[PDB]
Write an enzyme that holds these catalytic residues in place. Structure first.
Site, PDB file in Angstrom:
ATOM      1  N   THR A 171      -6.962  34.359  30.230  1.00  0.00           N
ATOM      2  CA  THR A 171      -6.886  35.689  30.886  1.00  0.00           C
ATOM      3  C   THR A 171      -7.163  35.757  32.543  1.00  0.00           C
ATOM      4  O   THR A 171      -8.041  35.118  33.004  1.00  0.00           O
ATOM      5  CB  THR A 171      -8.080  36.668  30.235  1.00  0.00           C
ATOM      6  OG1 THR A 171      -8.077  37.907  30.909  1.00  0.00           O
ATOM      7  CG2 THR A 171      -9.465  36.235  30.031  1.00  0.00           C
ATOM      8  N   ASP A 205     -35.391  42.505  -3.138  1.00  0.00           N
ATOM      9  CA  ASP A 205     -35.863  41.892  -4.535  1.00  0.00           C
ATOM     10  C   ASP A 205     -37.316  41.731  -3.984  1.00  0.00           C
ATOM     11  O   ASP A 205     -37.959  42.523  -3.819  1.00  0.00           O
ATOM     12  CB  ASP A 205     -35.118  40.410  -4.576  1.00  0.00           C
ATOM     13  CG  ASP A 205     -35.974  39.811  -6.015  1.00  0.00           C
ATOM     14  OD1 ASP A 205     -35.501  39.922  -7.202  1.00  0.00           O
ATOM     15  OD2 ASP A 205     -36.616  38.829  -5.851  1.00  0.00           O
ATOM     16  N   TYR A 217     -44.577  35.724  -8.132  1.00  0.00           N
ATOM     17  CA  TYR A 217     -44.663  36.055  -9.377  1.00  0.00           C
ATOM     18  C   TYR A 217     -45.960  35.834 -10.075  1.00  0.00           C
ATOM     19  O   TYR A 217     -46.259  36.367 -11.164  1.00  0.00           O
ATOM     20  CB  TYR A 217     -43.505  35.655 -10.301  1.00  0.00           C
ATOM     21  CG  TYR A 217     -42.218  36.240  -9.979  1.00  0.00           C
ATOM     22  CD1 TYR A 217     -41.789  37.387 -10.699  1.00  0.00           C
ATOM     23  CD2 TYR A 217     -41.309  35.542  -9.178  1.00  0.00           C
ATOM     24  CE1 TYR A 217     -40.736  37.931 -10.473  1.00  0.00           C
ATOM     25  CE2 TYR A 217     -39.897  35.902  -9.100  1.00  0.00           C
ATOM     26  CZ  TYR A 217     -39.625  37.238  -9.747  1.00  0.00           C
ATOM     27  OH  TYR A 217     -38.353  37.796  -9.566  1.00  0.00           O
ATOM     28  N   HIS A 253     -26.924  42.108  -8.613  1.00  0.00           N
ATOM     29  CA  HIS A 253     -28.373  41.570  -7.899  1.00  0.00           C
ATOM     30  C   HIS A 253     -28.483  41.035  -6.701  1.00  0.00           C
ATOM     31  O   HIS A 253     -29.316  41.140  -5.872  1.00  0.00           O
ATOM     32  CB  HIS A 253     -29.230  40.658  -8.793  1.00  0.00           C
ATOM     33  CG  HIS A 253     -30.589  40.581  -8.239  1.00  0.00           C
ATOM     34  ND1 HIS A 253     -31.445  41.386  -8.267  1.00  0.00           N
ATOM     35  CD2 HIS A 253     -31.060  39.334  -7.739  1.00  0.00           C
ATOM     36  CE1 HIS A 253     -32.574  40.762  -7.581  1.00  0.00           C
ATOM     37  NE2 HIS A 253     -32.380  39.717  -7.254  1.00  0.00           N
TER      38      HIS A 253
HETATM   39  C1  LIG Z   1     -34.192  34.798 -10.891  1.00  0.00           C
HETATM   40  C2  LIG Z   1     -33.461  34.572 -12.194  1.00  0.00           C
HETATM   41  C3  LIG Z   1     -32.112  35.299 -12.419  1.00  0.00           C
HETATM   42  C4  LIG Z   1     -31.506  36.095 -11.322  1.00  0.00           C
HETATM   43  C5  LIG Z   1     -30.265  36.979 -11.578  1.00  0.00           C
HETATM   44  C6  LIG Z   1     -30.565  37.977 -12.797  1.00  0.00           C
HETATM   45  C7  LIG Z   1     -31.172  38.964 -11.768  1.00  0.00           C
HETATM   46  N1  LIG Z   1     -30.596  40.246 -11.883  1.00  0.00           N
HETATM   47  N2  LIG Z   1     -31.339  41.302 -11.268  1.00  0.00           N
HETATM   48  C8  LIG Z   1     -32.775  40.465 -10.968  1.00  0.00           C
HETATM   49  C9  LIG Z   1     -33.967  41.065 -10.492  1.00  0.00           C
HETATM   50  C10 LIG Z   1     -35.063  40.282 -10.287  1.00  0.00           C
HETATM   51  C11 LIG Z   1     -35.066  39.061 -11.016  1.00  0.00           C
HETATM   52  C12 LIG Z   1     -33.695  38.408 -11.359  1.00  0.00           C
HETATM   53  C13 LIG Z   1     -32.621  39.120 -11.586  1.00  0.00           C
HETATM   54  C14 LIG Z   1     -32.426  36.128  -9.917  1.00  0.00           C
HETATM   55  C15 LIG Z   1     -33.731  35.546  -9.826  1.00  0.00           C
HETATM   56  C1  LIG Z   2     -38.522  41.514  -7.880  1.00  0.00           C
HETATM   57  C2  LIG Z   2     -38.781  41.690  -9.284  1.00  0.00           C
HETATM   58  C3  LIG Z   2     -40.045  42.263  -9.794  1.00  0.00           C
HETATM   59  C4  LIG Z   2     -41.132  42.672  -8.828  1.00  0.00           C
HETATM   60  C5  LIG Z   2     -42.522  43.101  -9.201  1.00  0.00           C
HETATM   61  C6  LIG Z   2     -42.671  42.746 -10.388  1.00  0.00           C
HETATM   62  C7  LIG Z   2     -43.108  43.952 -11.379  1.00  0.00           C
HETATM   63  N1  LIG Z   2     -42.062  44.716 -12.047  1.00  0.00           N
HETATM   64  N2  LIG Z   2     -42.804  45.718 -12.837  1.00  0.00           N
HETATM   65  C8  LIG Z   2     -44.457  45.592 -12.549  1.00  0.00           C
HETATM   66  C9  LIG Z   2     -45.575  46.219 -13.037  1.00  0.00           C
HETATM   67  C10 LIG Z   2     -46.775  45.720 -12.733  1.00  0.00           C
HETATM   68  C11 LIG Z   2     -46.830  44.696 -11.787  1.00  0.00           C
HETATM   69  C12 LIG Z   2     -45.811  43.895 -11.397  1.00  0.00           C
HETATM   70  C13 LIG Z   2     -44.391  44.242 -11.800  1.00  0.00           C
HETATM   71  C14 LIG Z   2     -40.748  42.241  -7.409  1.00  0.00           C
HETATM   72  C15 LIG Z   2     -39.517  42.072  -6.886  1.00  0.00           C
END
Ligand SMILES: c1ccc(CCc2n[nH]c3ccccc23)cc1
Ligand SMILES: c1ccc(CCc2n[nH]c3ccccc23)cc1
Ligand SMILES: c1ccc(CCc2n[nH]c3ccccc23)cc1
Ligand SMILES: c1ccc(CCc2n[nH]c3ccccc23)cc1
Lengths: 546, 546
Positions: A122, A334, A465, A523
């Site tokens: 340019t 997540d 977790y 996800h």
């Molecule tokens: C750990 C295991 C599986 C996956 C894919 C499946 C999935 N789909 N949606 C999710 C929400 C929390 C944890 C797992 C999932 C992510 C992380």
């Molecule tokens: C991704 C998947 C799950 C969670 C939180 C886990 C959860 N899911 N539902 C609950 C009820 C009581 C205490 C903890 C939980 C965070 C991020």
């Protein structure tokens, strides 16, 4: 055979051509045709404009010389330039009005993706105007997508001088017959043609791209919508903050403006935001993409308690303290989505705005143990499998490539079933040894995650977790509170664990909540639907985060 | 014997006491005395205010409860609150008006410098107001200067409850008799006194500090002006950008706002700006303090040509590109001062504003070789000594501690004479083996430079002086230009090499140039006169860089 594509800026990569504003100005002020264009080119290779384009003088030095040429031209034409005739005014407006010619950039991008060397050649100036930043931003956005940027004012040469074409071929390390050169000025095409380069005279973009597609043998027109710009890890600014003696947090940083802190999920990386980082920086934000504690270049202490939400949030506050940031907008996905709602509840003064992808806000149940609650939902089975230290680490660390290839899949790509994970005795028990590569990821992107997880593995990540009782007791302190700062909840239609319906009661605790929804999205929101995530986040940032 | 000092926030570290606004409001609106203060404390330990201070509810949730208490109180008092009576309005103004009580902070700083553990213990709230950032900034500024910050809303306890005092003593790891506790509320002092802590009732700061000085045996009142806040390297955010395959640039980053890029001189570090970094971040800027190429954690390639100004400037442009910054304000000192004027001349669109400490802008003489020019000034003799590769490296690398102790001295501290360095055969030939420590630096600060220079030594740094012919030819291209962007020239009275008179003709090339001048200031401007450098830079940044 072509292997290089060179593009002009004005009238090619940027529209409308700043040049063409002169003709528009003549018409608007009812001045004689060509008066402004004649004053602009006055003296040809000897004139003020050649000196400006060669870098001998700056744009502000040039403004009065252009004014004197306009007076000379008008006096010869026996006419009168008006009362308020100002070159600076016309010039400022022209540059402000000029934007990137998106389809031309897309074609250049596609050619580079197919192995072409790309360059911008340019005739430009050294801009020292008070409003020079607008052009600086345009050049920054454009230049990143090319291998080379050759500016007349920087090389002291100008088009159509033959020296600049010999310079161009030297930087390209290509013979003329291997080069396509696109320009809107016929006189500037001539030396390239004369050397044996393929030349395209650009009038309308469409015809130019039809010629470009025909000559390269690569589809550039009517192509599917391209993905947003991604990140090359080695081209990013990498940041490191010690939050406490044994803990250091890593982040990638891009852009200027209000700070936007991106918090990934499990088992992820700062790189999970690769498609959001360039887009949000381009939208006027300072992006801080984290490697959360336990991941990538951030520290990964072994102790479970180092990963409870109270300590994770305290460390994120310290992170802001040490960077000198009073606030940041917190965007999570997540596990990062969960942290982000707790940052809003416990530290609202440090959170400009809060956004979550997939992760809803559900308050602690003070009348039930978190284990009872988690057990009361078949999709949360995988969390009980994650409880016993070492079991999930062994399975997730056995073959990293298999781990990421099995996990990172779109909703229609045999996504792992989270029901009966404990019964089956693992996440990958019914998964192939060599999973196919998902449409969302390349082999190279999988290998980046593989290399990242080679440092600390899955202990630190899985510990997020392993604090259910600790997080429940801490969360119960916030049960009388409400989230009253700007908030965004983005749901994904096909996330079969973090289902959209789980977010249905959020308005009771966040009354002013804004929403986003992504159809046919699993996800892995950020890489599944990057274009729509960007659109939802930018719109919400510009309206509620400033 | 005292070893800990605890400070209240409202009415102690911050003034006027947000509390005292209630009395001011009653008087202004001609309301019955104590009406607002009575509604505020309604229900004592059971009321809305205790819940707010314990963190059960947020500030926005509390606003309507305070309004209902005000109505109840007014109805009993047989009075009428006006038409426009708004708690939010009163509260917003009160917080905006509250500033840091600078002499109280200074005393806390002095006690901590003398080995005391310091803490802020405060009854505070979870602020979710739209204007919460102002308070967040105040807390950020204050908290950095203390070992601990204990907030009622975060600990779920409140003053005067005895539990908070037991919590305080536990975090301090001190027995009550070792603690001074300062508060403006008599009822809040009572439990501390009752435990055996030394207590000070704060009315006017002066009397409180007289009591504090008497009890600690440390001068806090009528003390000399303190130096600005410095940096602890391990508490900074460290940034790393690859500008090209073999070159990576390191920087320290603090604050939010317009980017301010600090460029040190020879033989220095990002740490040369230690006194400017906290001050400029506090003034509303995003500070990027560089380790220039050849120094500290930045790469140091061996080749002389890697250090010519053209390549150094190109790499600084790439640095901005990779961080996603369209512009930065460039502030330089010594060699950094030189780079900074050339950034303005060759890349004005990337430079928001330009400032130089000591280094004037003197254009290339096209009618004389740079060697002829350098030889024509006795103070530039040392540059000829720096020419032959290896000689100066050997002398400067022999004893690092001696190198920095000999170099880093104030104008009255037997500063090295730069005349006849070649004749004498070195910089340190008439210098002691064990130089005394200058008033400007501590032993620890010298050791940081020692540790930094242990990595690459002096080759890369000295190469900045070994491109005179290359820099001269490049600079000659800019001879028709002018610097027309905002510019600041700061001269130092006692820099006997970069003398103020050397800057006398700058207005011919920078017509709109602004000036600063520091009396009784040597070459090491930033550490010699930090308070005045900060004042000159902040004032110029706020007026010309925005
Ligand atoms: C750990 C295991 C599986 C996956 C894919 C499946 C999935 N789909 N949606 C999710 C929400 C929390 C944890 C797992 C999932 C992510 C992380
Ligand atoms: C991704 C998947 C799950 C969670 C939180 C886990 C959860 N899911 N539902 C609950 C009820 C009581 C205490 C903890 C939980 C965070 C991020
Ligand atoms: C600190 C001291 C000196 C310089 C530039 C050296 C110099 N001083 N005078 C010159 C004349 C011609 C060419 C180079 C020079 C930069 C930073
Ligand atoms: C190298 C040698 C001596 C000093 C202190 C003496 C000095 N004072 N002013 C200077 C300007 C440029 C170079 C040196 C000086 C700094 C760096």
């Amino acid at each position: 055979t072509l292997r290089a594509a060179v593009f002009d800026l004005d009238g090619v990569l940027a529209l409308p051509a700043v040049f063409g504003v002169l003709g528009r100005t003549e018409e608007a002020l009812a001045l004689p045709r060509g008066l402004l264009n004649d004053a602009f080119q006055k003296g040809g290779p000897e004139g003020a404009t050649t000196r400006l384009m060669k870098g001998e003088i700056t744009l502000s030095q040039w403004i009065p010389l252009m004014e004197e040429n306009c007076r000379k031209c008008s006096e010869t034409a026996k006419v009168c330039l008006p009362k308020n005739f100002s070159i600076k005014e016309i010039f400022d407006k022209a540059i402000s009005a000029r934007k990137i010619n998106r389809p031309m950039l897309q074609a250049a991008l596609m050619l580079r993706k197919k192995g072409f060397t790309t360059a911008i050649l340019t005739n430009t100036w050294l801009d020292d105007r008070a409003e020079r930043d607008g052009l600086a931003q345009l050049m920054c956005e454009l230049k990143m997508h090319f291998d080379f940027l050759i500016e007349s004012c920087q090389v002291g040469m100008v088009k159509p001088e033959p020296q600049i074409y010999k310079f161009l071929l030297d930087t390209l390390k290509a013979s003329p017959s291997e080069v396509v050169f696109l320009d809107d000025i016929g006189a500037n095409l001539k030396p390239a043609r004369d050397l044996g380069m393929v030349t395209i005279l650009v009038q309308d973009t469409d015809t130019a791209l039809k010629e470009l597609e025909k000559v390269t043998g690569i589809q550039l027109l009517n192509t599917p919508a391209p993905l947003p710009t991604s990140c090359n890890p080695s081209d990013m600014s990498h940041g490191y903050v010690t939050v406490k003696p044994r803990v250091r947090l890593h982040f990638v940083e891009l852009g200027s403006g209000p700070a936007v802190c991106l918090c990934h999920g499990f088992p992820e990386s700062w790189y999970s935001w690769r498609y959001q980082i360039p887009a949000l920086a381009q939208a006027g934000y300072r992006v801080l993409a984290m490697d959360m504690k336990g991941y990538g270049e951030s520290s990964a202490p072994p102790e479970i308690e180092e990963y409870c939400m109270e300590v994770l949030c305290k460390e994120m506050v310290t992170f802001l303290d040490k960077l000198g940031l009073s606030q940041a907008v917190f965007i999570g996905h997540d596990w990062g989505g969960m942290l982000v709602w707790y940052m809003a509840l416990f530290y609202p003064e440090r959170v400009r705005a809060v956004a979550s992808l997939n992760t809803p806000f559900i308050p602690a149940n003070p009348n039930m143990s978190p284990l009872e609650s988690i057990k009361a939902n078949p999709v949360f089975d995988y969390q009980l499998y994650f409880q016993e230290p070492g079991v999930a680490e062994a399975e997730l660390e056995q073959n990293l490539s298999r781990t990421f290839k099995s996990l990172f899949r779109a909703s229609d790509e045999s996504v792992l079933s989270m029901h009966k994970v404990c019964e089956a005795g693992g996440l990958f028990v019914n998964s192939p040894e060599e999973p196919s590569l998902s449409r969302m990821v390349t082999e190279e992107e999988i290998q980046f995650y593989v290399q990242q997880f080679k440092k600390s593995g899955f202990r630190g990540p899985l510990n997020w977790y392993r604090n259910m009782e600790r997080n429940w007791k801490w969360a119960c302190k916030s049960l009388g509170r409400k989230i009253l700062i700007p908030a965004l909840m983005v749901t994904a239609e096909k996330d079969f664990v973090l289902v959209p319906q789980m977010s249905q009661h959020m308005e009771d605790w966040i009354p002013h909540l804004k929403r986003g929804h992504i159809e046919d999205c699993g996800h892995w929101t950020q890489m599944d639907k990057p274009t729509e995530v960007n659109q939802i986040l930018i719109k919400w940032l510009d309206s509620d985060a400033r």
